[PDB]
Paper text:
Like many Gram-negative pathogens, Shigella rely on their type three secretion system ([name]) to inject effector proteins into eukaryotic host cells, driving both cellular invasion and evasion of host immune responses. Studies in Shigella have demonstrated that bile salts found in the small intestine (e.g., deoxycholate ([name])) interact directly with the injectisome tip complex protein invasion plasmid antigen D ([name]) to support interaction with the hydrophobic translocator protein IpaB and its stable recruitment to the maturing tip complex. In Shigella, [name] resides at the extracellular tip of the injectisome where it functions as a “gatekeeper” that prevents unwanted protein secretion (leakage) through the injectisome prior to requisite activation events. Here, we uncover critical mechanistic details of the Shigella-specific [name] signaling process by describing the role of a π-helix secondary structure element within the [name] tip protein invasion plasmid antigen D ([name]).
X-ray crystal structures of [name]-bound IpaDWT and [name]-bound [name]ΔQ148 were critical for resolving this apparent conflict by providing the first molecular insight into the role of [name]’s π-helix in the [name]-mediated Shigella virulence enhancement pathway. More specifically, comparing these structures shows that eliminating the π-helix does not eliminate [name] binding, but instead causes the single binding site for [name] to migrate approximately 10 Å, now docking in the cleft between the two central helices where the elimination of the π-helix occurred. A closer look at the side chains located within 4.5 Å of the bound DOCs shows that while some polar and charged side chains such as lysine 137 and serine 141 in the native binding site and aspartate 144 and serine 141 in the modified site of the π-helix deletion construct are in the vicinity of the [name] binding sites, they are oriented away from the bound [name] and do not appear to contribute to binding through electrostatic interactions. Instead, both [name] interactions are driven nearly exclusively through hydrophobic interactions. Furthermore, the π-helix backbone atoms in the WT structure also occlude the distal end of the mutant [name] binding site.
Residue numbers in the entry:
A (entry chain A): 122 to 320
B (entry chain B): 123 to 176, 191 to 265, 270 to 319
The structure:
């Protein structure tokens, strides 16, 4: 299928290289850029919830360290977070793609960061909100109705799992940022290789 | 420069092969050697940290044994020298914490940054000279901490090399996605 005898003018070569550089920017770099931007915004809003949590935790019980946790306030904050990003996917930025295109980018970004979701007849790679869903299930398992008092043992157990899901989102965001950095360098190197064919 | 000049696909293949080879030589093989030299150095520092069992003149014997061993073992380049700006781009790429641009003459190298072992010596002489169970262990905390920073310098370098390999692997994937 390789044909070494195929001839191309230098002018045709310049235009084909230009066309390919544009395609790779539109279909690869800009895709990564929006995915990073979307996850970054989600984790920024989660971090505001984190700041708000300090107001939802306060000394409780009688003498000593018990913690009163405003569970319904935290619960609705995380529910509103999921609701804000239901329609802000990692890919694509606008409209939808086919299932194969979505699965392709699901694989590239990672099945723990994204999740393929059907919008209309088309598909998107949504932000995978499993860490938030885990926090909400864990909150519902604290029981109580609205507000719960947690002794040291139960506060430490709840907080350890909550922080681990926060850490997971941080790890996810770090991996996405590193992948976008690498994609930028893959693009730079492709430009250099293609330009070398003109040398 | 003449847009009408014709070029064959097999000529294009040879130019792309040339550029792939250049990237391996100029980028990947540079990272690999830097990982190698900082690894061998930190592995030799693990020598003296495992021999802590045995006092202070014992330690300097083997601690600037180390600095001496690696003064002509730069991170980059492997052989000969480069210009100052070439050394500065690779120091930028590898990190000012782990390397230091150094003028031999004939040109410049990016030597291994030996400040963790300098820092350890400053604290070594600082104390005096026997240490009680209280401030022997404060010292060992400072010593163990510089081990940790060299340890972490190595880790960060290995990660950058891993990412550089990924970049190369993906470049080759793109270029071979038709064949
Ligand atoms: C292998 C990738 C595939 C990227 C894509 O999906 O287009 C592409 C990217 C740029 C492509 C090349 C562009 C210049 C050349 C165009 C000529 O007509 C003959 C083949 C060349 C050398 C192309 C070969 C190859 O098709 C390339 C290297
Ligand atoms: C980009 C051209 C042409 C592709 C096309 O015309 O569609 C292809 C054709 C021959 C290809 C090479 C063949 C040998 C090598 C195979 C390796 O697994 C990747 C690097 C090499 C050096 C290839 C790199 C490159 O992928 C080439 C040069």
């Amino acid at each position: 299928e390789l044909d070494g005898d195929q001839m191309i003018s230098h002018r045709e070569l310049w235009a084909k290289i230009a066309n390919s550089i544009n395609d790779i920017n539109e279909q690869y770099l800009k895709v990564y850029e929006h995915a990073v931007s979307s996850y970054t915004q989600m984790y920024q809003d989660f971090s505001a919830v984190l700041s708000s949590l300090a107001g939802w935790i306060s000394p409780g019980g009688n003498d000593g360290n018990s913690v009163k946790l405003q569970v319904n306030s935290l619960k609705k904050a995380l529910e509103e977070l999921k609701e804000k990003y239901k329609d802000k996917p990692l890919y694509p930025a606008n409209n939808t793609v086919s299932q194969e295109q979505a699965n392709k980018w699901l694989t590239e970004l990672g099945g723990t960061i994204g999740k393929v979701s059907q919008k209309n007849g088309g598909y998107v790679v949504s932000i995978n909100m499993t860490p938030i869903d885990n926090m909400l299930k864990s909150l519902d398992n604290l029981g109580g109705n609205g507000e719960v008092v947690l002794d040291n043992a139960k506060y430490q157990a709840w907080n350890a799992g909550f922080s681990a899901e926060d850490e997971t989102m941080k790890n996810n965001l770090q991996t996405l940022v590193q992948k976008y950095s690498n994609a930028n360098s893959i693009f730079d190197n492709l430009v250099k290789v293609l330009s070398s064919t003109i040398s």
